[PDB]
């Protein structure tokens, strides 16, 4: 579909047998989800945003279903106020900005 | 135009006689620009992002030219690593997400 920006662009994601809502964020190079129970190995990593840097855990080869669209990629888990779908993923689902 | 997300969506903005580059951010409710010399009165305000809260100054009725498209609205000035064009503005220029 087509999302206008009068309200936040929130969408249903299915990650590791769990259902969540995430914001489609063109302003994010990466996808960062709040602490969820995800299986596999992960490494320590740090991402910056507007007030600072938070340490997250990177999980590679993670399968996600964004609004029914499947994609595989890097997913960062940490203390984010919201589940963010970033550029690494948006490209997989052929998402563009039009104006 | 149409922006694919292989690279960050950066665009030329013209604000108060100055030329800048800004990121089109669907993940932002507001537009926050780095400290620039803007005339008028402003109030203290705070915005949160992924590492915390930063205090900014709100300027209302600010004219901006986003990729040649004029719009008027609220603009927040503060210590952001990047000039962000948020939802308040994206709607004015008829910007949508498609996939």
């Amino acid at each position: 579909p087509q999302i206008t920006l009068w309200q936040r662009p929130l969408v249903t994601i299915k990650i590791g047998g769990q259902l969540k809502e995430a914001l489609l964020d063109t302003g994010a190079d990466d996808t960062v989800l709040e602490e969820n129970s995800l299986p596999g190995r992960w490494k320590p990593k740090m991402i910056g945003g507007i007030g600072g840097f938070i340490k997250v855990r990177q999980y590679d080869q993670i399968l996600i279903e964004i609004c029914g669209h499947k994609a595989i990629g890097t997913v960062l888990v940490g203390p984010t106020p919201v589940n963010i779908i970033g550029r690494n993923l948006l490209t997989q689902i052929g998402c563009t900005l039009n104006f | 135009p149409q922006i694919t997300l292989w690279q960050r969506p950066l665009v030329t903005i013209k604000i108060g006689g100055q030329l800048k580059e800004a990121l089109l951010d669907t993940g932002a409710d507001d537009t926050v620009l780095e400290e620039n010399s803007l005339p008028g009165r402003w109030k203290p305000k705070m915005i949160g992002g992924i590492g915390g809260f930063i205090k900014v100054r709100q300027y209302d009725q600010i004219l901006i030219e986003i990729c040649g498209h004029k719009a008027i609205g609220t603009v927040l000035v503060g210590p952001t690593p990047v000039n962000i064009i948020g939802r308040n503005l994206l709607t004015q220029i008829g910007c949508t997400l498609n996939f």
Binding site: - | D25, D30, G48, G49
Partner: peptide
């Protein structure tokens, strides 16, 4: 890196 407000 990555959401304002």
């Amino acid at each position: 890196a990555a959401x304002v407000x």
